[PDB]
């Protein structure tokens, strides 16, 4: 609906048309020059030669301005689809991204974008202009000279395309065979290199060389066959074009002898047919990978269509929240991660406002399931969840996400500065608040002990950090978010004792005048809970204070 | 020194020359046809047109037969260098392959071979033929018409190549910028995908999209600049060729007006210059990656030149060996794997013929160093090694390798059938001996319990196997080799007890009437040794039988 893109497309098509027109005009110019020189007074011939030169220069200019304009508009379009698909991809369920246990999604999306761009560019720069050229050639040859010339040029193009189509598959089979042979040789080389200790242990240094030589023959025959068939295809194309040129020139000469049309008219049709024939090898060399581009586009489309999982509901009502009330509770919670495997069943808690509640389990069965469920990653098909009297599934999503904050079991940090990771908790927060939160988290000492401090580079490719710093960063982010409800899922892996008391004190500071749900495996960390819940074989069996022991 | 390759090269060059000659003849043919039709009787014109067609067809045929012949000879050469470099690579020291802790060597060697082939093919198919074309054009234009035509065509080529060289670098800088921007965008996408849990934890789903959009601009500007500069370069080329054609045709017309040369001579020089100009864009599009091919070739050459490490000595005397004698011993052995770190020092053993000697150490300091040294992987610069009174360093290498057999600490198996791995111990061994050895090794029961048996596929990509089967395979290979001296370096990792007694019985069968050096960490495995050697802090301190305790 943007007129700018329509204007650019129209300009590109008009430039294509003008370019084809000038390409058609050029042989007319040459023929007029030849006739003028045959008649002889040289001023007219010089003018026609200058016209020939400027016409072909203008044709090239038109081609290239069309190329530049369409490149700009297409690349802008690629920027729009890529930006949209990125946001769309970051909306699916957690299960899909857990299944996609690789970073191949970025490669897939970029490959699809490049493939779409390549397909569009190849189509608009080859298919339409070549068909337009053929139509203009046929029309001008039929009107200027006769029907026979148009018929013979159409026949020449028909036999050329038929031959190319026939040879393409008979060559791609050999290409596939060579590719498989090369892969086999590479795998054999990998195995021989890997078994080098055993190779040295025995006398087998020449046997591996002989095997590699045999594999080199297996690749050799296919390579030779592919080269030979490529040469044969090129011969077919060139000979077809030669026969076409010879026939058209013979027809022009036969017309000349009768005196129907003037001498010097065969050279124009020769040049015109040849300039028609020029781009048909560029056509093939770009069609070579169009199938792969289309395959990549299909893969991207399928990945976009895996988006059938949508946890968002309709009628997004607002969430009424306040520091008081907000009594998180359950009602007959049953849920299964694995189809038919009751990981969690019969769970129902009761957390009053301002009270710290800690849940403790064994090796683990649903300990992190509470964190997953309360943040609305999965739907508890049985029972319900209550938050200030509001069901999780009956309220607008991202507002619920903003209401409750979580300190995760694990931690991942963006490949940026520490200050950016701290600020990630609240984008519109003042830097002074960020510094105060970081100081409150008991991390500023490690920041000043860092090689740089706030601006030090931390990431996967940055300097490595232990678990304690990541826990401090997560706690500080939770503080910066400032949620009325906090879910601290402390990591199962232990750390230094002093760090444990520091994080315990930090969490005690967090709990002040708010609701906190603690997950831990150490009794000393949960002695301060108002009520403690014990999880056994996926069920709740024990509730109460620390006086219940274990 | 093979006349076949010289004959093929001569045939290819002769076909190239004939092809260029025919390409030169074609415009002469067209000019003769034009003059014949201008004079008019049509039989001569028809004959000249037929000659034009057959001449251009023959020129294409000559090009392509040259292409096929040189492809064959070059690919054969590639097969020779690859086969030689594989054998040369499997001759270096163990340290180089330990340092090369990747399978990238095969990729490097294949990439280098393809790069050498590509460089040779591009050179022989573009540089020489184009220079020959230019020389023939200049000569024929100077002799047939005059010096001015040759001068102007040489000037046109000079300005074309100067413009292309000038624009190449100014475009490759933009190419580098675009490549870096694309890499940055991909890395940002990787980070955003990896931090998806933290993205969902907060409200930051649109912020990542905005950042990706900014990166898309950073890539966008470079892409647009590269497309624009490519279009500008193409305009420069086409306009230069247009000016050249216009100038040459104007000169031909000026010559025609004076009557010095006949009408219809401008079209021949036009077509001749254009067919000269035809391949100069193929030239650039193949030169695009010649630098990368040369870089790969340089990397392969450097890797071949890392071969300065050569443990082989001169004056390879034969090794006198017999089941008797062969008393392996040391004399003040000191060696350091890490420069300045005395891993092994002051080691001197004494193993009489037919006696089983076991060495036992702590966590490990030089336990496998004995296995490494006796098989001549490293040189003990201090002291000497005695084997039947023959120094290891003063005898031919691979015969010493064949004399002594080793059961390794670890094990690796070729990605082939079990029968092939068993036969790898002795290539020229009868299959019946292989079956008898396998049965003696206590493995045929597991073979018949296997899904297939002898022909089952076992490898990295095959079915996985535990350590016990690998140990049985190694023992059976050692039996098939049948060495007078055996060094059994039993793995530090333990296995099933019953498997331990079975392998102990197998080793006891091995020791019969031969010399065996055992390495183990279990006292029960070494109680049967004639004398036991205890290694402490890299030195020998305790020697004797089992009565010495520990
Ligand atoms: N995406 C998933 N699909 C299926 N099962 C899952 C998935 N994620 C986790 N589980 C299972 O959920 C069970 C309980 O998980 P969790 O709540 O983390 O307790 P835990 O991991 O066993 N104890 P802890 O290590 O302290 O968290 C585990 O045994 C997992 O096998
Ligand atoms: N290629 C090498 N370069 C440098 N140091 C090495 C190399 N190989 C081994 N070492 C070191 O030398 C020591 C001797 O290793 P080795 O002779 O295998 O006994 P071990 O590894 O100590 N114990 P075990 O597991 O019973 O073999 C090891 O501790 C290694 O760290
Ligand atoms: Mg957990
Ligand atoms: Mg060892």
């Amino acid at each position: 609906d943007r007129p700018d893109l329509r204007a650019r497309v129209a300009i590109s098509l008009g430039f294509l048309g003008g370019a084809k027109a000038m390409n058609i005009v050029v042989p007319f110019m040459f023929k007029y020059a030849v006739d003028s020189l045959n008649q002889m007074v040289a001023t007219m011939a010089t003018a026609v030669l200058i016209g020939y030169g400027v016409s072909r220069a203008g044709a090239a200019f038109f081609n290239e301005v069309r190329n530049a304009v369409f490149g700009k508009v297409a690349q802008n379009s690629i920027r729009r689809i890529a930006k949209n698909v990125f946001l769309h991809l970051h909306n699916l369920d957690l299960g899909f991204h857990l299944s996609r246990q690789t970073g191949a999604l970025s490669k897939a999306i970029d490959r699809g974008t490049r493939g779409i761009s390549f397909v569009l560019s190849a189509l608009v720069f080859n298919l339409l202009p070549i068909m337009f050229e053929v139509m203009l050639v046929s029309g001008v040859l039929y009107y200027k000279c006769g029907a026979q010339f148009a018929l013979v040029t159409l026949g020449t193009l028909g036999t050329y395309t038929a031959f190319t189509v026939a040879v393409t598959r008979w060559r791609t089979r050999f290409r596939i065979e060579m590719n498989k042979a090369d892969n086999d040789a590479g795998n054999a080389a990998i195995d021989s290199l890997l078994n080098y200790e055993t190779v040295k242990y025995f006398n087998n240094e020449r046997y591996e060389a002989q095997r590699y030589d045999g594999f080199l023959k297996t690749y050799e025959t296919a390579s030779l066959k592919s080269t030979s068939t490529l040469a044969m295809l090129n011969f077919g194309q060139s000979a077809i074009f030669s026969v076409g040129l010879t026939a058209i020139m013979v027809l022009a000469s036969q017309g000349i002898v009768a005196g129907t049309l003037t001498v010097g008219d065969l050279v124009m049709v020769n040049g015109l047919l040849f300039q028609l024939s020029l781009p048909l090898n560029f056509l093939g060399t770009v069609y070579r990978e169009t199938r792969q581009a289309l395959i990549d586009m299909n893969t991207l489309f399928t990945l976009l269509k895996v988006d059938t999982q949508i946890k968002d509901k309709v009628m997004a009502s607002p969430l009424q929240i306040t520091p008081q009330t907000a009594t998180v509770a359950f009602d007959n919670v049953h849920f299964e991660y694995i189809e038919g495997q009751k990981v969690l069943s019969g769970i129902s808690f009761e957390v009053p406002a301002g009270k710290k509640v800690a849940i403790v389990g064994g090796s683990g069965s649903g300990k992190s399931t509470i964190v997953r469920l309360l943040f609305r990653f999965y739907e508890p098909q049985k029972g319900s969840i209550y938050l200030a009297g509001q069901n999780i599934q009956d309220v607008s999503l991202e507002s619920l996400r903003r209401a409750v904050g979580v300190v995760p079991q694990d931690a991942v940090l963006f490949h940026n500065t520490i200050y950016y990771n701290l600020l990630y908790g609240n984008i519109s927060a003042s830097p002074e608040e960020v510094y105060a939160v970081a100081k409150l988290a008991g991390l500023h000492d490690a920041i000043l002990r860092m090689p740089h401090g706030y601006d030090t580079q931390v990431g996967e490719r940055g300097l490595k950090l232990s678990g304690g710093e990541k826990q401090r960063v997560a706690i500080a982010r939770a503080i910066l978010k400032d949620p009325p409800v906090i879910l601290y899922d402390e990591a199962t892996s232990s750390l230094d004792s002093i760090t444990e008391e520091t994080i315990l004190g930090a969490m005690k500071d967090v709990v002040k005048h708010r609701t906190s749900i603690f997950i831990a495996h150490r009794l000393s960390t949960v002695v301060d809970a108002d009520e403690i819940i014990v999880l056994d074989q996926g069920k709740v069996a024990e509730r109460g204070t620390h006086h219940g022991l274990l």
Side-chain angles (χ1 to χ4, degrees), chain A residues 1-39 41-100 103-143 145-287 289-296 298-306 316-319 321-323 325-354 356-381 383-401 403-448 451-460 462-480 482-487 489-494 496-506 509-521 523-546 548:
Chain A
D1 284 341
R2 194 177 182 181
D4 203 320
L5 304 170
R6 184 154 318 283
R8 302 196 92 77
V9 166
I11 287 161
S12 67
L13 301 203
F15 270 133
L16 188 152
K20 295 328 178 183
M22 215 71 43
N23 216 328
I24 291 315
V25 175
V26 170
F28 296 161
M29 296 297 103
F30 188 81
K31 175 251 192 181
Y32 274 133
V34 167
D35 286 348
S36 66
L37 272 191
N38 194 3
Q39 183 77 302
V41 71
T43 71
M44 291 75 93
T46 300
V48 181
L49 293 173
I50 291 306
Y52 175 101
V54 302
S55 64
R56 73 191 321 279
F61 175 84
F62 287 168
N63 284 13
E64 294 175 353
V65 66
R66 170 208 72 185
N67 278 9
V69 169
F70 195 90
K72 187 259 189 176
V73 67
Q75 179 40 260
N76 265 341
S77 283
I78 301 299
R79 183 216 133 167
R80 266 180 301 286
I81 296 89
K83 192 250 160 182
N84 201 356
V85 75
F86 187 88
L87 196 145
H88 170 267
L89 187 138
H90 291 171
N91 268 331
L92 311 184
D93 282 351
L94 188 62
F96 170 77
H97 292 127
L98 264 292
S99 71
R100 289 319 175 285
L105 271 69
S106 69
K107 274 76 70 177
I109 62 171
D110 67 53
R111 223 171 289 289
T113 54
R114 310 266 172 288
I116 288 304
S117 161
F118 181 70
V119 165
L120 201 53
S121 66
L123 188 153
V124 70
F125 298 168
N126 297 9
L127 293 175
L128 273 300
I130 286 172
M131 299 289 318
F132 200 53
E133 281 179 352
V134 176
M135 295 298 102
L136 294 174
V137 172
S138 295
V140 70
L141 273 195
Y142 168 79
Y143 276 116
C145 295
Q148 307 170 357
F149 309 79
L151 191 161
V152 298
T153 187
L154 284 177
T156 294
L157 277 296
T159 81
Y160 171 86
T161 188
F163 182 87
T164 308
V165 167
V167 183
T168 294
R169 53 185 191 144
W170 181 65
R171 294 196 56 249
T172 191
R173 79 162 61 180
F174 295 159
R175 194 151 321 101
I176 291 301
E177 296 181 9
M178 176 178 73
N179 194 1
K180 175 282 291 183
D182 191 79
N183 191 14
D184 192 11
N187 276 358
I190 292 295
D191 175 23
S192 187
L193 267 295
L194 278 169
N195 290 318
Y196 159 75
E197 289 93 32
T198 56
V199 159
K200 299 298 293 295
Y201 281 163
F202 319 105
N203 288 58
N204 281 316
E205 301 159 355
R206 315 187 59 76
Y207 191 73
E208 309 287 344
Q210 302 287 348
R211 295 184 70 257
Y212 200 61
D213 188 17
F215 281 102
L216 284 176
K217 293 179 179 179
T218 57
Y219 169 82
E220 202 62 350
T221 57
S223 181
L224 188 153
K225 290 188 300 180
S226 181
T227 311
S228 302
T229 188
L230 180 57
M232 185 180 288
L233 167 60
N234 285 359
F235 188 68
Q237 306 177 94
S238 188
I240 283 169
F241 277 135
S242 188
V243 176
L245 283 170
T246 300
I248 192 71
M249 280 209 279
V250 160
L251 272 180
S253 174
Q254 193 144 37
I256 283 180
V257 176
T260 309
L261 59 86
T262 179
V263 190
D265 187 36
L266 61 92
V267 60
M268 71 95 78
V269 71
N270 175 17
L272 182 143
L273 188 153
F274 180 80
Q275 63 84 30
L276 183 63
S277 70
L278 270 165
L280 288 166
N281 50 1
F282 296 94
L283 177 139
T285 196
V286 298
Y287 166 79
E289 62 268 20
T290 306
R291 196 57 53 181
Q292 171 62 26
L294 265 186
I295 289 177
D296 300 359
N298 189 359
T299 57
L300 187 153
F301 192 78
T302 52
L303 283 181
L304 195 142
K305 286 306 292 179
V306 189
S317 50
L319 194 150
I321 193 66
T322 183
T325 78
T327 65
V328 178
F330 306 88
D331 199 11
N332 218 357
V333 165
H334 312 262
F335 188 71
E336 311 98 358
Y337 295 92
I338 303 186
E339 303 168 351
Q341 294 203 350
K342 299 275 286 175
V343 185
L344 206 76
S345 55
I347 303 304
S348 76
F349 292 165
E350 182 62 37
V351 180
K356 164 181 171 286
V357 176
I359 65 162
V360 63
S363 67
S365 62
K367 279 198 302 167
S368 312
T369 298
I370 301 299
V371 164
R372 299 289 177 87
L373 263 52
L374 276 296
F375 197 74
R376 197 169 164 74
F377 291 165
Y378 308 106
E379 305 284 283
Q381 77 277 17
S384 62
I385 311 168
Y386 294 139
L387 189 149
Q390 288 166 137
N391 280 339
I392 288 187
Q393 60 272 47
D394 304 340
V395 178
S396 50
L397 178 55
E398 63 185 342
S399 70
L400 188 151
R401 304 290 197 74
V404 56
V406 298
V407 181
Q409 200 190 1
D410 74 17
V412 297
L413 304 184
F414 294 79
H415 189 276
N416 286 113
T417 64
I418 298 298
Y419 176 76
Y420 177 77
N421 288 355
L422 271 293
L423 188 60
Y424 201 82
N426 205 356
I427 305 93
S428 68
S430 172
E432 161 63 49
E433 300 155 32
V434 182
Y435 314 140
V437 161
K439 186 176 306 305
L440 179 57
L443 178 58
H444 185 264
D445 299 333
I447 292 177
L448 61 84
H452 207 317
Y454 284 164
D455 291 331
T456 189
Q457 180 58 249
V458 170
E460 179 82 345
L463 58 93
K464 293 179 179 179
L465 285 182
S466 60
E469 306 91 299
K470 316 177 71 177
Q471 304 306 87
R472 304 276 168 71
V473 164
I475 297 169
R477 272 221 279 273
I479 294 169
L480 194 42
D482 192 74
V485 182
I486 180 61
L487 324 176
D489 189 358
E490 294 294 328
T492 312
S493 53
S494 64
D496 194 7
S497 65
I498 307 178
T499 63
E500 281 183 357
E501 289 96 11
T502 57
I503 65 169
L504 282 177
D509 298 3
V510 179
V511 174
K512 296 318 186 317
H513 184 37
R514 75 159 41 86
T515 64
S516 77
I517 310 302
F518 275 74
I519 297 169
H521 52 95
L523 61 94
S524 59
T525 62
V526 309
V527 289
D528 296 344
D530 270 311
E531 59 262 17
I532 315 165
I533 289 154
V534 186
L535 188 153
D536 276 342
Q537 43 94 34
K539 323 280 304 185
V540 64
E542 312 174 4
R543 71 170 66 229
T545 76
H546 190 251

